[PDB]
Structures are given as structure tokens and as C-alpha cells.
Amino acid sequence: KKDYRKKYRKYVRSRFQCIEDRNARLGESVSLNKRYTRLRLIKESPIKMELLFDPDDEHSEPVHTVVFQGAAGIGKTILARKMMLDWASGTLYQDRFDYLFYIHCREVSLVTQRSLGDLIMSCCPDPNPPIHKIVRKPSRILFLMDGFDELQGAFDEHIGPLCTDWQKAERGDILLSSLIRKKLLPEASLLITTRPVALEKLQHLLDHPRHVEILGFSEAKRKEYFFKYFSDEAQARAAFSLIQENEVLFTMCFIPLVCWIVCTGLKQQMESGKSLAQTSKTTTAVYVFFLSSLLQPLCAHLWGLCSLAADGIWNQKILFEESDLRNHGLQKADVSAFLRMNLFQKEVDCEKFYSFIHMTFQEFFAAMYYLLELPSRDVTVLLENYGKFEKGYLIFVVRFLFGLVNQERTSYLEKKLSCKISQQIRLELLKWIEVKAKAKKLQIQPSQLELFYCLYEMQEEDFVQRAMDYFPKIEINLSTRMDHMVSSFCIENCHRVESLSLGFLHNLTSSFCRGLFSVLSTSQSLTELDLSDNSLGDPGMRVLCETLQHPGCNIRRLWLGRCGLSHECCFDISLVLSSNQKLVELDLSDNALGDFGIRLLCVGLKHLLCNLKKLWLVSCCLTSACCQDLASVLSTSHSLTRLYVGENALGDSGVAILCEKAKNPQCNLQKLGLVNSGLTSVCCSALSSVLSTNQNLTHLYLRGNTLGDKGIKLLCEGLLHPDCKLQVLELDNCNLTSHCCWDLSTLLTSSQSLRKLSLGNNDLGDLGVMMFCEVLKQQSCLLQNLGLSEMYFNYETKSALETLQEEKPELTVVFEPS
Numbered sequence: 001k002k003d004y005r006k007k008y009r010k011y012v013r014s015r016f017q018c019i020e021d022r023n024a025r026l027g028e029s030v031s032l033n034k035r036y037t038r039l040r041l042i043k044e045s046p047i048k049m050e051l052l053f054d055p056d057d058e059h060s061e062p063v064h065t066v067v068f069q070g071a072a073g074i075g076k077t078i079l080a081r082k083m084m085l086d087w088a089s090g091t092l093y094q095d096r097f098d099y100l101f102y103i104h105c106r107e108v109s110l111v112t113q114r115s116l117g118d119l120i121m122s123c124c125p126d127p128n129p130p131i132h133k134i135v136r137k138p139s140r141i142l143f144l145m146d147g148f149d150e151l152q153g154a155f156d157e158h159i160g161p162l163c164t165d166w167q168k169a170e171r172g173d174i175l176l177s178s179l180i181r182k183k184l185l186p187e188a189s190l191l192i193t194t195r196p197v198a199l200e201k202l203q204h205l206l207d208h209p210r211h212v213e214i215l216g217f218s219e220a221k222r223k224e225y226f227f228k229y230f231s232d233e234a235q236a237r238a239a240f241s242l243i244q245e246n247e248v249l250f251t252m253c254f255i256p257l258v259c260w261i262v263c264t265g266l267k268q269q270m271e272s273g274k275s276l277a278q279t280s281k282t283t284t285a286v287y288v289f290f291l292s293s294l295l296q297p298l299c300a301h302l303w304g305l306c307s308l309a310a311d312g313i314w315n316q317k318i319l320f321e322e323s324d325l326r327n328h329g330l331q332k333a334d335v336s337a338f339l340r341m342n343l344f345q346k347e348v349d350c351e352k353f354y355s356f357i358h359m360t361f362q363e364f365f366a367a368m369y370y371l372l373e374l375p376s377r378d379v380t381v382l383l384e385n386y387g388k389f390e391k392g393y394l395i396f397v398v399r400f401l402f403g404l405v406n407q408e409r410t411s412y413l414e415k416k417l418s419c420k421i422s423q424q425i426r427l428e429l430l431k432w433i434e435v436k437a438k439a440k441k442l443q444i445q446p447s448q449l450e451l452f453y454c455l456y457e458m459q460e461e462d463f464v465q466r467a468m469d470y471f472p473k474i475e476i477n478l479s480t481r482m483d484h485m486v487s488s489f490c491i492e493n494c495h496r497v498e499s500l501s502l503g504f505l506h507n508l509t510s511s512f513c514r515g516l517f518s519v520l521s522t523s524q525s526l527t528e529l530d531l532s533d534n535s536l537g538d539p540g541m542r543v544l545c546e547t548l549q550h551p552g553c554n555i556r557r558l559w560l561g562r563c564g565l566s567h568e569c570c571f572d573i574s575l576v577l578s579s580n581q582k583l584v585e586l587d588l589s590d591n592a593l594g595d596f597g598i599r600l601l602c603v604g605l606k607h608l609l610c611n612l613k614k615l616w617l618v619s620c621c622l623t624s625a626c627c628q629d630l631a632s633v634l635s636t637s638h639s640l641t642r643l644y645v646g647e648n649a650l651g652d653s654g655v656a657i658l659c660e661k662a663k664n665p666q667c668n669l670q671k672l673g674l675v676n677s678g679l680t681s682v683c684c685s686a687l688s689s690v691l692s693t694n695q696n697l698t699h700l701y702l703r704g705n706t707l708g709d710k711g712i713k714l715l716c717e718g719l720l721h722p723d724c725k726l727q728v729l730e731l732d733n734c735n736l737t738s739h740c741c742w743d744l745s746t747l748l749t750s751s752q753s754l755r756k757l758s759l760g761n762n763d764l765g766d767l768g769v770m771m772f773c774e775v776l777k778q779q780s781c782l783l784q785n786l787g788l789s790e791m792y793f794n795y796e797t798k799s800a801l802e803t804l805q806e807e808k809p810e811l812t813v814v815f816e817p818s
């Protein structure tokens with residue numbers, strides 16, 4: 001006679017009022033979830049806490065599945081709890097979902113066979129809810145899978161027997177897969193929280209997810225967290241100030257877990273009348289510091305604890321029974337000690353399982369196990385399984401293992417580590433880096449950013465430098481301040497990096513990136529800097545321009561890409577060209593360098609001592625109005641030899657102006673990249689004058705103009721001139737047809753300077769090609785690709801071309817279409 005939804009909501013509202021559903025809450029005080037600090041959500045572009053499933057603007061298409069992703073300790077699990085509570089309180093999705101079902105991926109194993117009893121297991125104490133009634137209705141429920149990457153057991157996407165029908169019992173991975181794929185209870189919305197490392201598995205199940213990334217605390221939010229943690233503002237201020245001075249620790253504290261660990265550590269020593277010691281710089285240092293302060297005041301059974309953690313990692317166990325603790329010599333002692341000073345939790349949510357505070361802690365202890373004095377005790381085995389889902393990726397186990405190896409160590413727990421073992425681990429870790437650094441493949445295992453963090457953690461100059469000698473190239477993507485901090489350290493200590501690519505991600509449009517650019521200026525060996533495909537807008541270009549004026553810059557190639565360069569920022573680029581004596585190549589493609597921007601660039605290019613040799617201005621929205629300045633550069637500049645100005649709005653007068661100055665016999669222009677300049681037959685005579693006059697012009701690219709048959713005739717007259725030295729002529733779709741084939745045939749026999757001639761997607765016809773085959777037999781000087789790309793023929797012509805390829809081997813490539 002009563003509506004179960006009311007009781008369900010009450011149960012959820014009462015249950016989800018604890019951060020970790022645990023005891024040992026600083027004397028088991030009220031959790032007070034009001035302490036929650038707002039996390040920012042970014043759509044893979046800020047998104048509201050609500051409207052996560054709502055339809056987008058395009059086609060009003062709704063999303064059933066939403067996936068949250070983020071770093072360990074970012075608070076994925078807490079955000080999920082907050083949503084659950086806000087719903088139960090009638091604030092979030094008040095009119096969208098009747099039930100929210102929390103699934104703890106730490107509790108649900110894959111091996112055990114079971115029906116979809118999740119709707120009962122996570123509900124109120126009443127064992128017989130109305131499953132067949134309102135609970136049955138699709139589109140009215142939301143599932144929350146919290147910690148996909150924490151699932152214990154092997155998990156494959158390759159499941160045939162998905163087994164729909166909630167009434168039937170099946171294996172956990174099968175049941176899970178069916179729900180994720182929306183085969184089980186179709187139209188049931190699903191929210192997943194996971195570390196990005198598990199996306200390699202989810203990508204095959206989600207099909208059409210919406211992705212949202214979770215960010216950590218902002219500077220203002222960090223302040224709020226620290227204050228909320230303490231009852232005494234004076235203590236919060238003293239603690240905040242200490243951390244703020246430690247720039248490195250403060251940076252790390254953007255992760256909620258890190259600031260939690262730091263706060264707890266400081267509070268515990270504060271209560272003892274200590275001066276608030278804290279010198280941690282690395283993630284490992286924070287965890288070591290925490291355990292040192294916690295256990296030092298105990299550690300006799302630390303080996304057993306480390307063994308327990310190591311066993312759990314290898315045997316796929318997060319939750320432990322009292323029987324498992326007893327089997328490690330842990331009974332009626334350690335558990336109590338770890339509750340008086342929270343190190344280990346009982347998860348007292350009407351349950352008898354024990355666990356670590358966080359998976360990060362469990363991995364820490366497992367790593368510690370490898371440096372002491374029984375699943376392995378072999379680092380080789382540990383490393384070989386690093387990238388495997390089945391072992392939880394072992395990211396922190398290894399990352400901490402690196403951090404725990406050093407010479408600059410003291411007392412307090414870490415003194416119990418064996419020197420001989422540590423030295424052996426160091427050598428094995430270095431060999432591991434060499435192998436992974438060389439194996440430059442796309443994968444979740446080390447991909448040139450993580451081999452870096454796993455180095456930062458070991459602040460030893462000799463080790464890091466030795467490792468860096470295996471990194472001739474660095475290709476990384478920086479997401480947050482933490483990546484900039486690590487990248488800066490690593491790059492600064494590099495001596496043999498020749499090529500660096502920094503794919504900055506949205507945080508730029510700020511001075512934020514300054515922290516890394518200032519490092520590049522001190523490099524002695526860096527040659528190529530690639531800053532393509534990122535929003536290095538005006539202020540980004542400005543800080544880089546300052547960086548590039550440094551006397552120790554030593555950068556030769558500046559490959560800017562779609563940076564969104566504007567009219568004004570080009571000024572700063574000019575100031576680099578006129579000062580920097582080493583820069584050779586510059587690529588400003590796909591920017592808004594309008595006529596104004598080019599004029600400024602040209603001022604720099606005409607400056608004495610500008611040694612720029614290759615200039616790319618492709619797709620720069622250029623018009624004929626600016627060709628006058630580029631023409632002046634070609635005339636006066638002795639160093640510029642390669643110019644690419646295609647994919648612009650140039651006209652006939654545009655190229656003719658460049659030609660009138662480029663024809664000068666003292667011009668050093670070698671490559672004229674008029675790939676797509678909207679050229680017509682009228683302007684061709686200008687190109688002809690240049691070809692017969694410029695003895696340095698070896699390559700002409702007209703791949704996309706509309707030269708036409710009259711145009712090619714005129715171009716031929718130029719090319720046929722005895723003083724023309726052109727080696728490569730590229731004529732892609734120029735709207736040429738059979739009517740001009742007689743001149744192209746003549747060109748092949750009369751011009752002795754050409755080595756390559758390539759016709760592209762144009763209907764030359766069969767007559768032209770057949771003639772080519774015969775004339776090319778007459779001791780032709782053309783050896784390179786004949787082209788005729790994307791052009792198709794009958795069988796007779798194809799046979800002739802195949803014959804040509806074999807009959808005269810001197811022509812390396814005929815390039816038949818098939």
C-alpha cells in the first residue's frame with residue numbers, strides 16, 4: 001500500500017553521509033559531507049553537475065551512458081557519492097530518476113555467478129523489494145559503477161553469451177558487460193567512474209558514451225579545503241602557510257587525496273606539540289612522510305603488512321577477511337593501531353571486510369615489499385606485468401618503487417630497507433626505462449609522460465641523466481600543472497634530446513606555460529621544437545618569442561601549427577627573426593596571418609642577419625595585397641630559399657608580382673610552393689620568365705591551380721628554354737586535358753633539365769599516355785615518378801604502362817593506378 005520509492009530514498013539519504021563509509025574518523029566523529037569541495041567537470045568546456053545525460057543541441061540526441069574519468073585520488077568515488085546524496089535529498093535529477101543504484105566495483109567480483117540482485121544488494125534492509133513493479137520500468141533508473149578499474153579478476157570485452165534477462169544468474173564479467181553495453185535493461189542510464197588506464201577496455205563496450213573529465217582543486221578551493229579541515233582557523237592558517245611555501249607540495253595538493261594525507265599528517269604531529277615539519281617534494285615523499293609520522297610514535301609487523309598488500313596485488317584482492325590477516329601474523333594488534341591512527345579501515349558499513357584507505361596506499365605497501373630483507377619478491381616479474389589490467393596496471397607499485405630507491409635517506413621506517421636489494425632494483429629499473437623508451441608505440445604502458453613521472457620521483461641526478469640518454473625524442477601532452485612540473489624537471493635535465501613536441505592541452509591563453517618554455521631556452525642540444533595542434537594563442541606566442549631571444553636558445557626549427565596566431569602576435573615573431581641567429585625553419589601554417597601580419601613578418605625577414613631559409617605560409621588567408629612584401633623579401637633576402645604560399649586567395653597579379661622580383665638572376669629561391677594559389681593561364685607567362693632566368697629554381701609546385709591547356713603551353717615555352725634548370729615539375733589537377741598532351745610529350749623529349757614530372761588528377765587521355773610511353777624510350781633524362789596519379793585507363797594503356805616500367809628500368813616509378 002506504500003510507495004517503496006520513499007523508503008528507498010530515505011535509506012540512501014541516511015547511508016551516503018560518509019566520505020569512505022568507515023570508522024576511525026579522527027575519533028569516529030561525524031563525517032559532515034558539507035566538507036565536500038566542489039570539483040570542476042569538463043566535457044571532452046565546463047559542464048554542470050546536472051544535465052549530464054540530457055540531450056545535446058544537435059538533433060536533441062539524449063545520452064544513456066556517461067563516463068567520468070580522472071587520476072587516482074582525484075575524488076571520482078566522492079563525486080559519485082555526492083550525486084547519490086543530492087538525488088536522495090531531492091535536488092539532483094528530481095524528476096528524471098526513480099532509483100539510483102550504487103555498485104561498488106571493489107565489492108563485486110567477476111568469478112561468482114549471480115542474478116541481477118544488485119538492485120537488492122544496494123537497497124534498504126528489506127530483502128524483498130518490488131522488483132517486478134515500478135523498479136522494473138526502463139528510463140527511470142540510473143546505475144553507478146564506481147571504480148571500473150578496481151574490478152578484481154581478468155576482464156575481457158570478447159564476450160559472446162552476454163545473457164540478457166535480469167532474472168537469470170550468470171558470471172560477473174558477463175553480467176557487467178551486458179549492462180555496460182545496454183543489452184541488460186535497455187534504456188537504463190549508466191554512469192561509470194574510472195581511471196583513464198581502463199579506457200582500453202571500456203572503449204569496446206561503451207559504443208556511444210559521453211565523456212567528462214574530473215579536475216582537482218583550484219587555488220581558492222584548496223584554501224577552502226584546508227580551512228574546513230580544522231576547527232581552529234589559526235591552525236588552518238599555520239598549516240596552509242607552511243604548505244604554500246612548499247610550492248611543489250602545494251602543486252601536488254591539487255589532488256584531494258594528497259591534501260588529505262598532508263592535512264592528517266600535520267594534524268597528528270600538531271597535537272604532539274611539533275613545529276609542523278614537512279619537506280616532501282615527491283608523491284613518494286608524501287606517503288613516506290605520512291607513514292613515518294603515523295607509525296614512529298608499530299612497525300614491527302610492517303613486513304607482514306607489506307606482504308599482505310603485495311599478496312592482494314598479485315592475487316587480485318582489495319578486501320580482506322580476518323582469516324587473511326591472521327595468516328600474515330596480523331591479529332588483535334595492528335588493526336586497532338591502524339584505527340587509532342587511520343592507516344587501515346574496517347569499512348564498517350554493516351560488513352566484515354577490511355581494506356586499505358586507498359588503492360594508492362595498498363600499492364605503496366606492495367612496492368615497499370620489494371625492498372625489504374610471498375607472491376614473488378622479483379622486480380623483473382613485477383615490471384613484466386606492468387601494463388596488464390589483470391594486475392591493476394601496477395602504476396603506483398612501480399612509481400613508488402622508483403621513489404623508494406635513493407641514497408638521500410634517513411631513519412624512520414625506510415632504514416629497514418636493504419642496500420644490496422635497492423642497488424639491484426635501481427639497475428633493473430634503468431634497463432626497464434631503456435627498453436620502454438625505445439619501444440615508442442601507442443599504449444597505456446609507458447608512453448614518454450609516465451616514464452617521466454616515474455623518474456621525477458627519484459630525485460637523483462646521475463640516475464635521471466642516465467635514463468634521459470635513452471630519450472632522443474620527447475612527444476608529450478600536458479594536461480595539468482602536475483604534468484608541467486614533472487615535464488619541466490625532466491626536460492631541464494636532458495642533454496641528448498634533439499626533437500621535442502609539446503601538445504599543450506586546455507588547462508592555454510595564459511602565462512601558465514611559461515614554466516616550461518623557460519626550460520627550453522637552456523637546452524644545448526634541442527634542435528626541433530614542435531608546437532603544432534594546440535591553442536598557443538597570442539600570449540603563448542609572446543612568451544615563446546621572449547624565450548627564443550635567449551642567447552642560449554640553440555633552436556633551429558620552429559614548427560608552429562594551428563596556434564591561432566593573429567595580426568598583432570606576428571610582431572613578436574618578427575622580433576625573433578631579426579635577433580635569433582640560429583633559427584633556420586619557420587612554419588606559420590593555418591593561422592590568421594592576414595596581409596597586415598605578413599607585412600610585419602617581412603620587415604623581420606628583410607632584416608640583416610636573418611638566417612631563415614624555409615618559410616611556410618600555407619593557408620594563411622593571404623591575398624594579393626600582401627604579395628608585394630613577400631616579393632620584396634625574395635629580392636633582398638639572400639638566405640630565403642624555400643617559400644610556400646599555397647592554399648591562399650592569391651590571384652594572377654599576386655604571383656606575377658612575386659615573379660617579377662623572383663626572376664632576378666641573383667634570387668636564391670629554390671622551391672616555389674604555389675600549391676593552390678588560384679592561378680590561371682594569364683599569369684603563366686610570369687612563371688615562364690622566372691623559370692628561364694632563375695638558375696637556382698629547381699622545384700615548382702602547382703598542385704591545385706587551374707592552369708589549363710593554354711597555361712601549360714606557356715609554361716612549356718619557358719621550360720623548353722635552354723637556360724631553364726627546373727628539376728621537378730608537379731602539376732596535380734590543373735584541369736589539363738588531351739589537347740595539351742602534345743606539348744607535354746614535347747617537353748619530355750626537349751627538356752634535359754627535368755628529372756621528375758608528375759601529372760595528377762586530370763584527364764590527360766590515352767593518347768597522351770601512350771605517346772609518353774614511346775617518347776620516354778628515346779634516352780629520356782626523366783628518371784623519377786612519371787605521375788599520372790588517380791588517372792584511370794583501358795586495358796591497352798595499362799599494358800603499355802606495365803611494359804614501360806619493365807622495358808626501361810631507368811624510370812623508377814611509372815605509378816600505375818592499380
Ligand SMILES: Nc1ncnc2c1ncn2[C@@H]1O[C@H](COP(=O)(O)OP(=O)(O)OP(=O)(O)O)[C@@H](O)[C@H]1O
Pocket residue numbers: 019035036037038039071072073074075076077078079146147150256257260358359
Ligand atoms: N570534494 C571533496 N571534498 C573533500 N574531500 C575529498 C573531495 N574529493 C576527494 N576528497 C578526498 O579524497 C579521498 C577519497 O579518494 P577516492 O576514494 O575518491 O579515490 P578514487 O580514485 O575515487 O578511489 P576509487 O577509484 O577506488 O573509487 C578522501 O579521503 C577525501 O578526503
Ligand SMILES: CN1CCC[C@@H](Nc2nnc(-c3ccc(C(F)(F)F)cc3O)c3c2CCC3)C1
Pocket residue numbers: 071072073196252255257258283286360449450453480482
Ligand atoms: C594517468 N597516467 C597517464 C597520464 C599521465 C599520468 N597522469 C597522472 N598520473 N598520476 C597522477 C597522480 C595523482 C596523485 C598521486 C598521489 F596521490 F599519490 F600523490 C599520484 C599520482 O601519480 C596524476 C596524473 C594526472 C592527474 C594527477 C599517468
